[PDB]
Amino acid sequence: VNPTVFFDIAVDGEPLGRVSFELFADKVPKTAENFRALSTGEKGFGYKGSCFHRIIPGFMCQGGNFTHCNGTGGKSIYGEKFEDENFILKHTGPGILSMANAGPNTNGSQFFICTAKTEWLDGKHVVFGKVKEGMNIVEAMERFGSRNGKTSKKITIADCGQLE
């Protein structure tokens, strides 16, 4: 069965709610495994305590830099960067979970959650999962974003892990 992960999201230390993701291990097993393991903290680091540093309403919510609250940092469980596994799955709509990058074969820990269809990213970012529950919680995060991406409050992964 494809693994499932949850984030418990907080806004300036106050719980906002739970988002859960199916990870498409059947089709992107390396990429899925990186996210699953960073979700559980089982390599000794991961997403717990990290921020969404860039939120653009109607586009996406980006996070997973567990070193700083910004777009420069994080590593995968395989090393600093890993390859683009494949581009089989597309950015079809809201809820798509995809890897952030700085160009080809530069995947680390950062990811983003689409809140719309982002067809122009297809073949550029590896899609590896999708929101199951709490798409309402993702939408509620947008209130704290802006057109440039800056957040007006600190949006954190207060807790995370694997459900199945």
Partner: protein, 136 residues
């Protein structure tokens, strides 16, 4: 240069060589450099620099100036991960601007993008800052 891209003119190259041989790195070289490199890509600028025969210590000082400006670019333009909005392209690093890690095709992509990132003009400014230190 880009006017479309064209290979750097060999006689413009040779004019530049002549200017350095006669004026070494006295003050008069900077205007000539400037005049002779209009629309230049970083690749073109490097061809100009790499055609300087000798002047080893002058070139070392220049290389050191470029590295400082490249490091400063990186410190103020950190390489934040995407994804980018449609039609947008990725910003150059300091080593991309200097032509160290960017191909001619990538430089043209920046220079002809809309709006453009004029990596040719940015790097030419770094070079001119370096020349001003050398003439001293």
């Amino acid at each position: 240069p880009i006017v479309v891209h064209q290979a750097i003119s060999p006689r413009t190259l040779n004019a530049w060589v002549k200017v350095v041989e006669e004026k070494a790195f006295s003050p008069e070289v900077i205007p000539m450099f400037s005049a002779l490199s209009e629309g230049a890509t970083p690749q073109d600028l490097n061809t100009m620099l790499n055609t300087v025969g000798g002047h080893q210590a002058a070139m070392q000082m220049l290389k050191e100036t470029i590295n400082e400006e490249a490091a400063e670019w990186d410190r103020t333009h950190p390489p934040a991960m995407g994804p980018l909005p449609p039609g947008q392209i990725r910003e150059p690093t300091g080593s991309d601007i200097a032509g160290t890690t960017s191909t001619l095709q990538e430089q043209i992509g920046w220079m002809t993008h809309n709006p453009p990132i004029p990596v040719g003009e940015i790097y030419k400014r770094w070079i001119i800052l370096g020349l001003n230190k050398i003439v001293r």
